[PDB]
Design a binder for this molecule. Structure first.
Ligand SMILES: [Mn+2]
Ligand SMILES: [Mn+2]
Ligand SMILES: [Mn+2]
Ligand SMILES: [Mn+2]
Ligand code: NA
Lengths: 439, 439
């Protein structure tokens, strides 16, 4: 209903984007390939299918390989829809959902017979997809041209009302998962149990997740890319960091929360001060501001915490200026969110693809684009006690300034990250995560 | 330590097989590549890693890409082990498992630095792996040579004692899941509930499964390649079919069971009749017998059931000769089981790759090899009510012999498959599945 109505403006937006970039580049149209299933080496089984983001930008068809979109922004969008009729698969119903009527739909019963449906002379058609040797066999010469990709990726940061509603739906699902995971942690669950309570609440399997969930207990919290799920619980429950989202129509949620098992003590205090900073930074998104400036503020807030909690024996400014904050907060403040988890265009200054430079002391900041309305952001400040980086810091002049006893007291708890998904509007902010009352 | 004792003989067998085909094909050795992580098109996320079956044939390292085995059958096997050292990665300590003492281990810190650790002259070295341009760029000319592949695949049918013990462990894990899945079905749970009850009892996540589980309710049991997990339970529970396994050290279980929600009725009797036929088919495994003959016997037995239940109003011999039996049982009786679900060499007559011809009226039969000691088989007779196959039958000159009223009563139950994993010994058969008291 609501989604069906908004979808028309979504097709209109993408039609106008196609017309603009195709005509600017002298192309008669785009051919966007959903992708193919990858077969495993020496085996008959396939890897799980992952749709081309450029394909699902047009319609919520994320589980169908060998599908093709032909668009020029002037004709009605043309869709080749893979629909095999083998007896060992449930034949799917011909496309009858809200997006069907916005396309002229040709059914494809076998992947290799796709050349009849594609354009005969395709010298002025750009193939957008991963399978370049399949494209060359079909007769395409232009493949993923950089001006077309950079244009599309740049305007991906401006979500249509259909996309906004999809991102809201994804946050509603993910938030239900986060609540069930929290409860499982406080009842003494293992990482594996917490993870599968999450999926049971989301009604989405491991491979439907938009990214590999991070479900960490105790010192695993300090491991940023922790992917394992330990099946047996730890003997003592201290902390819990879950980074997990959900999918809706190809769009992603991306939520992180950190919990203290005792819900009191110095680590519990650390979560709450970090929560204050996270809420404040999340309220600092505003059109016309460079995202890197929020990353700057975040480091100052982390330094204030390090100073106030006696983690570093320095006032806040010194901890920022000597670069010690990046030992405890080593990643960017956040990124754009949408069809991809770390969405496209976050580092661009213009639609040609020029990079927007990061701030002076953070050359690895990846999201530096100017904030505008209709853009969706993550805000994920963190403070971690990472053995590896603490080791680096002990080999510097800064070794004298860190309270090594107090850091040993926090190492069992690992670290903290608190992440929301916020829509930036013309004169307001919409925090999708906290409007669903997670906390 | 039981498993570690058997592993020494395993490596002696692998060393000897390597030396045989290596010198027969005039190679100085093999270079077996574990694989790489496949990155998502225009993303930073990756696909779940799946190890090269030839790599894990040597060792139970199934979650590490960029690993290399250099083996010639005479020298101590060399293992280049990928151990990256990054702050966001969990640094695991140097390999200290039961298999480590059997390899000269060199640590690989960055994937592209492997050029130094491989043999300098690669003229007579064969690369076994998927990433052929990576091999060409390292200097390999010999790649997955067919004489080597056919030899190694042929002899994978003869499991070592280490391999038989791993297969028993896989079955034990899977049987626990099958008990949990069954209990959730009788609780009225959804397909999604059952699947995740299975994962939780086995304490393995969806991607650690050796294949995509088939968890089907009611009509979905008739769909042989069903992968969906419906999150909403059906209003009426009639039937449940689950085909699922588990991993142990790279070796797979593969167990199928069918259940009737009421523990009574004609479908319940059909399951029970099919069960006794499945037990008799499984007890017909015998050294010196062609596996195709059991597939013929299976078709004979399914015709018996179709006649006995008045699905087809014909003597069983006339059901077989007229070919009606494939409409209800369209796949093979089973396959070899091991490192891969449908394991290698089940089509071969000799170690050079020569195919063993399938039986008369079954040219697509995949498993045909001569049964011998130390081989592992599945026995999966089936009986299904498949719309598109039943439609084709309704348009043949046998249509008057089919009891369409009874077939219509069976359609909401879908179908039946019962699958066990059986080791063939010299003087006995070891039904791993039924030895675990699953029923
Ligand atoms: Mn994020
Ligand atoms: Mn996240
Ligand atoms: Mn099987
Ligand atoms: Mn099976
Ligand atoms: Na042996």
């Amino acid at each position: 209903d609501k989604l069906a109505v908004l979808y028309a403006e979504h097709i209109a937006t993408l039609q106008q984007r196609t017309r603009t970039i195709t005509e600017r580049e002298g192309l008669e149209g785009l051919v966007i390939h959903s992708g193919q299933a990858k077969r495993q080496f020496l085996d008959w089984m396939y890897y799980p299918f992952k749709v081309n983001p450029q394909f699902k930008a047009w319609l919520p068809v994320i589980d169908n390989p060998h599908c093709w979109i032909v668009v020029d922004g002037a004709s009605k969008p043309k869709l080749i829809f893979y629909r095999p009729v083998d007896f060992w698969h449930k034949v799917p119903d011909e496309p009858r959902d809200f997006w069907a009527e916005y396309f002229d739909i040709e059914l494809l019963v076998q992947p290799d017979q796709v050349e009849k449906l594609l354009p005969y002379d395709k010298a002025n058609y750009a193939y957008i997809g991963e399978y370049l040797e399949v494209a060359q066999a079909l007769g395409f010469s232009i493949m993923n041209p950089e001006p077309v990709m950079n244009y599309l990726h740049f305007h991906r940061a401006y979500k249509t009302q259909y996309e906004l509603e999809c991102l809201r739906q994804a946050n509603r699902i993910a938030v239900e998962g986060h609540k069930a995971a929290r409860d499982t942690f406080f009842n003494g669950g293992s990482e594996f149990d917490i993870q599968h309570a999450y999926l049971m609440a989301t009604r989405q399997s491991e491979n439907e997740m938009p990214y590999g969930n991070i479900v960490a207990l105790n010192e695993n919290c300090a491991i940023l890319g922790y992917t394992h799920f330990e099946p047996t619980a730890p003997h003592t429950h201290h902390s819990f960091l879950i980074d997990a989202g959900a999918n809706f129509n190809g769009y992603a949620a991306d939520i992180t929360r950190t919990y203290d098992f005792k819900k009191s003590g110095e680590f519990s205090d650390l979560i709450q001060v970090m929560t204050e900073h996270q809420i404040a930074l999340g309220k600092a998104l505003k059109p016309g501001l460079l995202y890197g400036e929020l990353h700057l503020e975040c480091h100052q807030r982390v330094a204030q915490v390090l100073s106030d909690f006696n983690i570093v024996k320095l006032p806040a400014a010194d901890i920022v200026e000597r670069g010690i904050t990046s030992t405890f907060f080593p990643h960017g403040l956040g990124h754009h969110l949408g069809l991809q988890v770390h969405d496209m265009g976050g580092f661009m200054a213009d639609e040609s693809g020029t990079h927007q430079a990061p701030p002076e002391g953070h050359p690895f900041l990846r999201c530096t684009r100017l904030i505008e309305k209709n853009q969706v952001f993550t805000i994920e400040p963190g403070l971690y006690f990472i053995d590896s980086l603490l080791g680096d810091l002990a080999q510097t002049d800064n070794k004298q300034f860190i309270n090594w006893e107090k850091v040993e007291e926090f190492k069992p708890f690992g670290g903290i990250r608190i992440e929301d998904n916020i829509i930036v509007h013309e004169d307001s902010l919409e925090n999708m995560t906290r409007d669903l009352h997670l906390d």
